[PDB]
């Protein structure tokens, strides 16, 4: 009602990679591409809010 609001001017995405030898990054990528093992996470709260 009284105060003003924020005003975005520019947004950028930053991302830092671990500098890893291409010899072993290909191997790690080869493993993670396998069907047997894939990342799996669960919400910490893990609840259905009503």
């Amino acid at each position: 009602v009284d105060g003003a609001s924020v005003r975005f001017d520019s947004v950028n995405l930053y991302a830092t990679f671990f500098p890893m030898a291409h010899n072993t990054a290909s191997t790690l990528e080869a493993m993670l591409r396998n069907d047997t093992h894939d990342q799996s996470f669960n919400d910490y709260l893990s609840a259905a809010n009503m």
Binding site: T24, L45, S46, A47
Partner: peptide, 27 residues
């Protein structure tokens, strides 16, 4: 094979500790 990636604490690599786990819920 992959022991060459681990820091060496002497003549042996610093490996072990099968704690590749995750269990995080409010419970």
């Amino acid at each position: 094979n992959f022991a060459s990636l681990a820091p060496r604490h002497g003549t042996r690599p610093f490996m072990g500790t099968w704690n590749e786990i995750g269990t995080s819920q409010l419970n």
